[model samples]
Target: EAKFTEEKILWVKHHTPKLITFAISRPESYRFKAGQFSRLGFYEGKGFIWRAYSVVSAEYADTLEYFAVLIQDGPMSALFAKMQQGDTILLDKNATGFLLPERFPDGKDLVMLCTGSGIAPFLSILEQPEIRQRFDTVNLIHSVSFPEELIFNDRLAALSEHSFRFVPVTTRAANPSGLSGKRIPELLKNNSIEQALHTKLTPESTRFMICGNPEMVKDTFQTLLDMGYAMHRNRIPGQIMMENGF
Candidate 1:
């Protein structure tokens, strides 16, 4: 058997001209962790184009869902632009990523930091009941350029009634309320993230899971390291676990 499957698209939702959410039929054996990504593809002209998209659906969900941010001239974006329900898409059998929350040996709080489509994995992780009950608090900090990019507000809000916190940060635009105009690293340095989350983040209590643009992930990791946190490793368990969103 090939390492891939041709699954039918179950649905497609256009949130904005540049943003989309879609689901595809899941093979009975398909499996993935909350923070892992799925390799999806299609035939484009003479070649096949494969792209990695984080699985945004819960690990137990029957269908596989994904979020995509269209690029101006990207091949995958073009494919997604014209894609519709019932269309066939290619999917690699195995999912992959190491950003799972269980990577941290132990910590009191789980802080999920992301930007743009990076928020996808966090949304998936939020559905895991173990994560919800294991930590004292679960915080999601999503940074985007504009207010309109905060498309998961209602969804995140529904999860907020639990031991969950959601903070929306926009760097290029402002909302009358919530955080605006500060990047993730700066927000951490200034403690504004703490202000917004309503809890002080001590290194001993905070376990961070970061996903976002390459630069943001790097800078945020540097900021956390500078603040005395270390990267997580299996043998040398530490406070931070991360994956590049792109």
Candidate 2:
């Protein structure tokens, strides 16, 4: 893997005990699409520990930003949680992922489903001006366990003036009023999501993107498959795209 040495952390924001957003200085030649992931290396004395994180910053942003969920007992999580501005880090020279716009087919609407930090890539996509120009409607359905755990709600809410709709869902909150409290698969299973958006997830009209937990991804993918939507691939270029949350 290619490596960029001694990159500096520009800033860090702790959204919750488990969620954080941080920015790092972008290398001069390190360019990446909105939905790509890069390997981030943290120094550990004699060597470094690397982890893959999706870029939360848009392709045009001056700095690279990432959203991460802290794994309490994980070594990397411990390091990142304590990271501060100006801390030295390393990044992979190349960004890689299959969630970029090139993978999806043209459609009337782009529907996205994500949970936790899985919303990272979609954040990048929404930040780009072309995403608004490309589709008639862009619906982002984000799920989390609590109301306070909803990341990027402010940013997404501000972008609602365009072809964007932000639907925040909470699964375990007691008074998650005005928000769907069911898991995404469950919402899709009963057409609750469609009711909320007043838009159908028809194979011919809507292109879907699913990201989050493995179970959420698998269940949502299977549900869409049953609804007659096909997964996107380079050769087939179907109506859906997917990426697993790390």
Candidate 3:
């Protein structure tokens, strides 16, 4: 881990009422594997207040970037939302997460299922050229309550040729364009477009990365397991990877 103090704000985009992204300066020597997350903070005392945010920028990009959801009372959220370009913030040297290609066994389709801020890591994984080439196909299933909150619309559209599919499902949404009135679980249960890709969910192929609300995480994880997808381990490196927004 290398400490960097000269953190400059790079850019900002307001995605929704509760979500905003502030791109910060990356130290020249800083390096991270795509899909890893970094701890960003605001120093207030002996211990700095921080939150883990997945790096959303492509791995090859010189400057690091992340997509974050703002929590109203959360320590880092408010300041991060209001931060202007050129402002400085603290970025911890360590970036880690299990949401990597290594978690999947080779020769498979990769399914990144997310809701709200959970969309962050999938953004990183899909943008990686190597990962795109490795998997037979990549499906980015992002579910947000509202349609307006779909953050990376333009980027997802441009990557259509890369064997990547971005499917936005919304439950409390008002849009007709989205796969109407559906959630990830519903999509999975009914065996729609998603279920068509699998013979069964297993380590040999079809690794899943799930992130969202706790209940959503638990239910979805169990549902996958009931259907036979097991928790991926360091030794096996197969089947599924699950985490919550917390």
Candidate 4:
């Protein structure tokens, strides 16, 4: 009943040495928008370590799923490295974020661009059938360092009934997947995303949601702005919305 609710871990999936995804039991009263995130905490040596992770579950799901990338020597990563199902974690009472796609008054296509763990929120948003019905087309572009890092490819494919397009970019070594790019931002700059989606990306029809590191977010935002899109606002509608995942 407190601000922090103690929840039991339901499962933990390690996709790679540094990539992990987990689910926690959700209380009956727990509620969150698909694009929002909850603050998770663990009691460490002398203090509680809190980190916000985008909720990767649908709004109606009984569990709250989250994805994370373990950082070298990160305090939270250390805890997650040893954590398992049946462990206990703290969940804040409220989820918060403004990256929800529903805010757009209108658009013909929804294009999500992400890197690393930034794909979390978009995964949640795409789960809702309403989102698919609202847009004529939908695409997801994920950028990772290695082929093994593209863990969500199979899962994303399962949600294709609503016309989902998944493009994986593997940077670091020669990519056998035909997607060779070092930085994710290059996709927007080079029109590679549109090429893969087979649709022209215009300010009027393409609504973009970007989530990633601050640098990637800024770079992508700037690229979009240069391409005729503006920051989406309530009073003044635009074509782009973004948030920093790291």
- In terms of lDDT, the poorest run of 10 residues in model 3 is 193-202
Residue 221 C-alpha lDDT in model 1 = 97
lDDT of 2 by residue, 1-246 (tens): 445656999999997878899999987889888877999997688988999999988888889999999997999999998889999989888889888764565888889899898999998888778777888899999988887887677767777753678888988884343265589988888888888787777888898988899889999999999989998876897988889987
TM-score, prediction 1: 0.97
Which window of 10 residues has the lowest lDDT sum in candidate 4?
173-182
TM-score of 3: 0.88
Candidates 1 and 3: which is better by lDDT? 1
Residues 185-231 of candidate 3: C-alpha lDDT, one tens digit per residue? 76777765365443444546677889877788898887887777778
Deviation in Å, model 1, residue 60 alpha carbon: 0.9
Candidate 1 residue-wise lDDT at 178: 67
Clashing residue pairs, backbone N/CA/C < 3 A, model 1: none
- Residue-level lDDT tens digits of model 1 in 1-246: 998999999999999999999999999999899999999999677978899999999999999999999999998899899999999999999999997897676788899999999999999998899897789899999998998888898778776853899888899999655688889999999999988888889888999999999999999999999999998876888899899999
lDDT for each residue of candidate 4 in 1-246, tens digit (9 for 90 to 100):
478899989999988889999999998888988889999998777978899999988999989999989999998999998899999999998899999898898999899988889999998998888899999998888887887887887767566534678888877765564366557677778888788788899999999999988898999999889999999987878989999997
Best to worst by lDDT, what's the order?
1, 4, 2, 3
The ten-residue window of minimal lDDT in model 1 covers 154-163
Question: How many backbone clashes does every candidate have?
Answer: 0, 0, 0, 0
Estimate candidate 2's alpha-carbon lDDT, on a 0 to 1 scale.
0.85
Report lDDT per candidate: 0.91, 0.85, 0.74, 0.87
| Candidate 4 or 2, higher lDDT | 4
Model 3, runs deviating above 4 Å:
1-4, 45-47, 193-204
Q: Which ten residues in a row have the lowest lDDT in candidate 2?
A: 172-181
